[PDB]
Amino acid sequence: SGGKVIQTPRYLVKGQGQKAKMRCIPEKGHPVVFWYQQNKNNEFKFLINFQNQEVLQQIDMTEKRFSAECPSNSPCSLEIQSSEAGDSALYLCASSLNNANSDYTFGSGTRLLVIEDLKNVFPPEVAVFEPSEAEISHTQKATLVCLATGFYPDHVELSWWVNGKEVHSGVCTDPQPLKEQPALNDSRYALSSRLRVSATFWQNPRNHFRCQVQFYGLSENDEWTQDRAKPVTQIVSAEAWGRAD
Amino acid sequence: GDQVEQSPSALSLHEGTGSALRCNFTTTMRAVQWFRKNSRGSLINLFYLASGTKENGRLKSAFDSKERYSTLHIRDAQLEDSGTYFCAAEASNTNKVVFGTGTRLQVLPNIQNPDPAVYQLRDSDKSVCLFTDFDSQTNVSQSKDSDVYITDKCVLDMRSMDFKSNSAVAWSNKSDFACANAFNNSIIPEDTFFPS
Amino acid sequence: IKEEHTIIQAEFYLLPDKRGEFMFDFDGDEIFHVDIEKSETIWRLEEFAKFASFEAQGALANIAVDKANLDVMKERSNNTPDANVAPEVTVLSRSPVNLGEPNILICFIDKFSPPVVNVTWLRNGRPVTEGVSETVFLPRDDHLFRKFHYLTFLPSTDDFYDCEVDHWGLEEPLRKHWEF
Amino acid sequence: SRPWFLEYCKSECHFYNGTQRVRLLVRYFYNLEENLRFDSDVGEFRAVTELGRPDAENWNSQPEFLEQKRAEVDTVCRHNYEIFDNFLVPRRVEPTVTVYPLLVCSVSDFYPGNIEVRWFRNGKEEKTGIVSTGLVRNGDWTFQTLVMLETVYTCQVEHPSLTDPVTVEWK
């Protein structure tokens, strides 16, 4: 499609030594594809560029440690053969039309995290809090608050769904989820969100509110020998109904 | 070390004001490109300049090949203009695109009628505290003792009613925790409304 | 008091010879060229290199593309008809010739296409291998090419030189003569 | 015969009166035939023969490409002139004049090609019976020429590398 570049998956967590394959669909009609690796310092590290199937340029690291191909009529891919801690970064895919040009159009990017032990992975607990009556009397508006707690890594995407439709107006989500325990590492995370609607709207019991959290974790192929449930990629939800006076 | 000199590093604009971002080049550039990364958003392409100026809504961009610079101008700053801005250009004497150091732009909303208040919300049986409707001059500080949590402030926009409001959420499990002492760690407005 | 100049960037890729070439021209003279195989910039006069630079892998990249384009143009053109424009050869001395005084002979191959020639220097009817220099295929105003061959020599009334140029457009290898 | 295939590309930067007026002319060739052009005074690709039309239609539909090319008059052409004006443009090499028997005036080893050579007999410019070879390019940034007079005796040489004209005379 286009004009949009689709990178999947949005997030990715892998254990040290595992393979990390990420995909990118360049814009429709776009033969040029670039792969960039961005670190915490907003630095863009060039990895490899293709035109269609032919590789025009790549670096030593990508030559030795990465394997990439851009098959005809198939999603481009970049795969790390043996993941290590240093590979934790944002991988950006950019497609162009003319090699003798700029006008990159970047994709959403794939956030990759490499950790030692996959036993540290936890799904998020989701809880919805109903509007305080004080706020309704004072402001004639109603604020719902959603809390996602106890997940790892910080790879979640929160959304508010009112009556089966995704909403954006009046929605506020924390920029960065916070560590539940700043001391110690590999600490589980917490994330909050608010949805404010008019008092009259909240007091209609026919209106349905849902807080949905997409967690990006292990896959079906990943092995899991613990007692507790397998922390796979999954949707965790909590909801609330409208309430009269 | 091999990036484009982009200034300023960070920027705070009051809603409805304006300012300019600038890239300084070390040589003649072939063309310049400007990007913006949202909050949890993709990189959005803003401009492609080879010469002169281009204007897109509340954004105008300029590129002077000879004088070796490019500028991005924001006017009438809105909430959605928040994000990180990057420029990218490739030198005329090389084949390689090089990026700017980046600029973090934060836009503070204009709160016409401040109404600082703290409410308590029950689980639809957990409970949370909500600091809301304060002005942008108020700064939210992190909760100290490890059993209480406080998030950084956040702005929501009810487009239908043309109303914007600040808000921060705090919660705990500890039994000594009450909404009255939730946001004590911060310097809150004196006239903060405390129900119940 | 009017400065009127021209700078030309010429690059090409040739089949079946499988060679590409990259060079910069200033008012008709070569500024530099890039050894595609070796990947290094070759300044026409050594003294130029103190004043300028050229990133060579830029030129390599181009020829790589020019290679690919050649296949596209081949498939595009319904019929590619072989045709040749024969060179015109001229031999003369760089400086006024004085006996016993070191000099240079110039073989000026001009107005030809494709850029492929066999050029041979002949001292007294025999090929010379020592003291010969060669110029890459230089551009013109038209579609045709230009080339220079040089020979260092010591003048004597006993020696006579020739430059022999063979090109796919000539029936018989053209030989141009020069003596004292 | 022997079939050959050539993909030739010349990007010409024309400077009239320094960097004041500049035009860029990119010419694509296939073998002996020029098929595509980009004239900065036109601002778009134009096909010279049908063989180049696909490229023209393809590239002209890319505004951001055309925008870049039109701009290459500053980002490349004027750029390079700034560099080459330090050593190539002002380059001067003083000519060596020699006279020998028709009388030949041998002007050799000079740069640039701007040269004026006249024949004076008894102090008057013999503006007739003049056989010249024209300007000859040695290819190593040096020029040479032979201006001849067919009379049965002094020639003058004027050149940008000469503050005062060079004169030689015979017996």
Binding site: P31, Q51 | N93 | V65, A68, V72 | D55, T75
Partner: peptide, 13 residues
């Protein structure tokens, strides 16, 4: 050592 600039040649078709 200020480097001369060149034109990038684009892929056809």
């Amino acid at each position: 050592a200020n480097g001369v600039a060149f034109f990038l040649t684009p892929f056809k078709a």
